C-alpha cells in the first residue's frame, strides 16, 4: 500500500560551497538523493551567522564552524532530514545551538537531536511527504560532559543542548590487581585527600566488590576484561520516544553518533549494539550510525538494518575559515598562523591524522525501500571522497567508479560478516543486502 | 454576466504536513478546490510560532495548537478564504489570536471572524478575483464565556477575540414542577445565600412568571419543553454587517460554528435555524455550518442553501504535538506521558471518543455556482477521512470512492429530507441539489 | 529573642492620589503602618501603564484598573508586602498580570499570589527585615473560571494567572425532590440533548447517589441542606507551600480572598473555615481574609488568629477613570457617559450598591506582635472610610475617632462571639484580643 524510500549517510562536515561538483559521478549522487522520499544526514558542523562563543573542544579535533550558507549546499545536494546530535553541535555553546535551531527553522529544514531543553532534544521530528511520513530521532554517545540538554525545573529554565546516550565503562581486574590498586591509593596519600569527603557525605565515595579510583570504575573478576553499558535513564528515555514516534509515522529512523571503539577500532562498543537492538525492539525501522569517520559493519536484526557507521559523507575539516584561539594554541608557531597553514602544521604537513589513510575518504549511501513498514530492499551506493587529492578538493562526495565501489563494497561485506550479513553485487559496483523477507 | 463558483467545507483541524497525499483521490480533491473561484474552510486550529499561553479548554476537548507551517498546507490544498470564529481560535488566549492574525496577514490569506476588537471580528473580509468578489463573515455560537472580542471605550482598548452568536436556553416546566424548584431553593438554604445580593441590587436576581436558578432559566408552561433563542444584540449586529457586505461584493457567505444540538444530535438548534433564515433574509447567498464534527442536513431557503454542518474536512486532533499541562491532567498516569500516548489513554485505547464511529470521518465539499447572485448549481462531493485507518493516516481528506460516496450522499439526503431537499445522484457517487430556479 | 510586628488590612481599592490626607487621624494611620515590621494589604486593583486588554468581569462589579502611580501611594502609606490573588488581578488579562508583576518588581515591592505560571502564583514571597523575616502566601476562592494560572507542560508554556482555592457546592435534597429533578430533566427533553455525550464518553455525565444537572451538584439526603468543600488539589498544594515557607521564615501569613457567604452573609463559607484551620495546622502564624467588602468575625485557633474579612482598607471604586465598553453597556444611556456619570447611574444615583450602607465604610487594621513565633499581642485599630461623605472624598482611610471606633469594635466583637473570641477595649476605641498565652 505505502512504499517509501530512505537514503542514509554519515557525517556531513561541510565548510565550503560547491558541494556537488560538475563531475557526472557527483551529479549522479545528487540525483540519487533527490529521488528518494527522505534523505538523512548528520550535520557535523555548526552553521553560524555569529551567535555564540567557541568552546574548548580539543579532544574533538577542534571547533567545526561554518558559514550558514552551507545549509543551502546540504539541501541542494538532496538531504531533507538532518540529525544534529553529535560532539560538534555545541561548538559555539548554548547560544550557538540556539542559533542553529533558528537557522534550520528559517530554511524549513526538519531536524532532531538538539533543542532548547532536554525534551526538545529527545523529541522526534516528523517529515511529511505525499507518500508517507518519516520520524527521525537523533542522539550521541560522544560529547563533552555538560553539553547534554536539560529540562526545566519549577524555578529555573532548562539548558539548550544535545540528546545524550551516556554510558559507563568498567575495568575488570583480578583480586590481586585490585589489592595493588587500593595499595597505590593508600600509599600515595590519595586516600588521605578524600578524608573530608568522607566526613561530608558519610562514607568513602571510592568504596562502592566495586571500586572507583582515578575517575575509573574497577571490579574484581575471574580474568581481566573491559565492559561498557548504556546509561539506564538515557536508554529508557530514548526508547520511550521511539515507541511514541512509531504511533505517528510510517517509518522511524534512529540516528546515533558514537566514536567509542570496541575491542578493535572497526567494531562498535558493546553498549552501542545493545542500544541498536533495543531501538528496533521498540519499533524503529532502521538505525544509522556515525562518528569514527570510517565505515563499520552492517547488521540485520529482526529484518531491520543497523549501520554502525557510515563514515563521512562530506569531510572538509581542513578547509574551515574559523579557527579558535585555543585551537591555534595546539600548534607552536613562531608567527601568527592562517587557517590553512594551521591545519598543515597540525597534520604534520599531511603525514598524520586523517589524510594518509584511505578509510577516512570512502563512504556509503544506503537507499532503503519499505513497503508497509517491511524492508523490501537495501541498496548500497559506495561514495568516494577523493583520497590523495589536494586539500581543497578532497572531501566532496561523488558516486565511486566501478573499481573503487567494488573495493568499498568488499570492505563493508567484510566488516558485516561477523553479523551474518550477505551482499549481492552489481556490475557497476553498487550492491544490496540479502534479505530474509 | 458574472459567474462564480464557491467550494465549502467544515472543520479544518490540521496539525501535520502532507495534507494532500499521493492518492489520486486526494490529488483530485485539491484539483477540485483549486478550480473554484473561492474555497472556504473553518480554521479549527491555532497556528502558532510561540505567541500566547494555553487556556483551559477542557469542554472543547483540549487545546488545538499546531506549527504555523500548516497554513501552507491549507493554501496548497486549495483553500483561499478562512473562517476563524470557533471554540478553538482562543486556545492561546488574546495573544494567540493576535499571533494568528499576524500569521494570516503575512501569508496573504483572507480571514474573518477574529479581530483585535469586536468590530474587527464582526467585519466581513472581501476576497477579490478577476471574475468577481466574495464577502465572508464568520461567527460562532460555541465558545468559553469571555472569549468574545470587545470594542474599545473612550478610556480603555477593546479585547481581541471572536465574533459571537450568543443564545439562551429556557426550560419549560409545569406549575407544579416550578413550585418544587422554588421549594428546593428555599429549603436547601440557597435562597438565604442571596440575601445580600438582594440588599445590594434591590431585588432577588432569581425572581424575573420567569425564574433563574442554578444558572438556568425556568418558565411555567402548559407542558415541559425546551427552547433556545439567539441573543438579540448578536443577531442584529451580524445581520447588520451582512447587509453591509451585500453592497460591496457579488456573493456573501456566512460561516457559523455551533456544537449545540437540537432535540436529537443530528438536528441543529432552533436558534441556529432562525439565525440562518435571518442571514439569507438580509442578503446572504449561502450559510455554511460546522461544529458537531459530523454531517447535518441541507436546507434550501428562498433559493439559497443552508449547510447546517459539513463536519470535518481535516481531522488530526490525535496527532498534535502540543498538549498543555491541564490537558495532561485529565489522564491519570503513573509516568509522564508523550502526546501520542496521552491521546491513546484519553480515548480508552481507541474504544471511545471519535475513533469508533464512522460519522466523524465522512465529509462533504459542496461546490456552488452563482450567476448574478442566483444559485444555478450546487454539486455535492463526498469526502472520506479514513475511518478505521491508523491514527497517523486517518483525518486526511480525499474524494470518496463510488461506494462510499453513495453512502455519504444517502446520509445527506436523509438528514436533509425534513427540509424538503432533493438530490440528484451521479454514477461516480457525487450529486447535486434539486433547485427551483 | 526575635520580636516582630505585622499589620494586616483588607481590600486596597486605590484609584486616586493623596491616599493619606492631611487629617491627623489619617497621618496617624500611616505612622501606625510605618512603625510595624511588615504591613500586608490586598491589592484589589490592576496598576497599569497600558499593557493588557479589559476582560468582561460583570459579576465582579466591573473592571478595576488604575494609574500605576497608585503603587507609590500604597508604599508611602506604609504597606510593604502585597497580596495579589483576588477576583480583579486578571482584569487586564494575562498581559495585564504580567504588567503588574513588572511594575511591582521595578518598585521593589514584595508580592505573592500571581505569577507567570501556577507555581509562581503559589510560591511564598520572603520579606526580609533586620529583625526577622515574613513569608506571605496569597490565594483566592473568587475568580472567573480560567483565570487561575497554569504550570508548563513538556510542549507548551504555562499561563499567567492567580493562585486558586477552588471549591464545590452540593445541594442536599430529599429523595422525592430528587425524583422531581430527574423528571424535569427527562420531560423537558434536556436528557435527550445529552444523547451523543453518552455515546462519546460512554456514560451519562449527569449520573454520578449523586447527580449533576443545570451545572449544579445534587445529592439525596435526609433533609435539605447546603454544603461546600475545598478542592482537594488546591488545599493540598497550598498547604504544601505553607509547610515550605515555615522552614524559611520567622512568620508565615496566608492571605485568602473569598466573597462566598455562609448560611448568613456575615459568616464565612464552611470551606473557608476548613481552609483556615488547615493553614494553621501546617504552620501558618495568621490567616487574613477579605472579599465581602465588609467585616467578618475573628477566630483564635491553636493560639493563632484568623481574620475572615477585614473589609476594605481603601475603597475608591466609583473614582476610577478606566471604564470598559462592556461595563458601560450595563447602563442604558441616551448619550455617551463619562466615568463619574456612569457610576452615578449604576448605583441609582446613590440609592443602591455600597453607598447607602455603613458596613462597607468601616475597616479594621490589626497589629500582631510575635515573639519566637508565639502570638503575644493582637491590637485592633478600627478604620473609618467616610460613610456619607461625597464620592470624591469617601474611601480614604483614617483611624476612627473614639465614638466610631467603639462601634466598630463592638461589631467585630459580635461577629467574633460565635468563635469564643473576647476583646479588651481601650479608652480611645482601640482594643486587643484576649489571648491564652
Ligand atoms: Ca564526531
Ligand atoms: Ca468545534
Ligand atoms: Ca473582591
Residue numbers in the entry:
A (entry chain A), B (entry chain A), C (entry chain A): 1 to 208, 211 to 439
Give the article text.
The in vitro experiment revealed that all variants lacked epimerase activity, indicating that the four residues are crucial for catalysis. In contrast, the loss of catalytic activity of the His295N and Asp11A variants could be due to a structural collapse of the metal-binding and substrate-binding sites, caused by a breakdown of the hydrogen bonding network between six-coordination motif and Asp11/His295 via the w2 water molecule and substrate. Therefore, we evaluated the His295N and Asp11A variants from a structural aspect. We obtained their crystal structures, MslH Asp11A:apo and MslH His295N:apo at 2.41 and 2.55 Å resolutions, respectively. Both crystal structures indicated that the variants retained the same six-coordination motif as that in the wild-type MslH crystal structure. The His295N substitution had no effect on the active center organization, while the Asp11A substitution led to the flexibility of His295 in the MslH Asp11A:apo crystal structure, where a 1:1 alternative state was observed for the His295 residue. Moreover, the comparison of the MslH His295N:apo structure with the MslH:MslA Trp21G complex structure showed that the distance between the Cα center of MslA Gly21 and Oδ of Asn295 atom is 4.5 Å, which is longer than that (3.4 Å) in the MslH:MslA Trp21G structure. These observations suggested that the Asp11 and His295 residues would play important roles in maintaining the appropriate catalytic state of MslH.
The lasso peptide MS-271 is a ribosomally synthesized and post-translationally modified peptide (RiPP) consisting of 21 amino acids with D-tryptophan at the C-terminus, and is derived from the precursor peptide MslA. The crystal structure analysis, followed by site-directed mutagenesis, docking simulation, and ICP-MS studies demonstrate that MslH employs acid/base chemistry to facilitate the reversible epimerization of the C-terminal Trp21 of MslA, by utilizing two pairs of His/Asp catalytic residues that are electrostatically tethered to a six-coordination motif with a Ca(II) ion via water molecules.
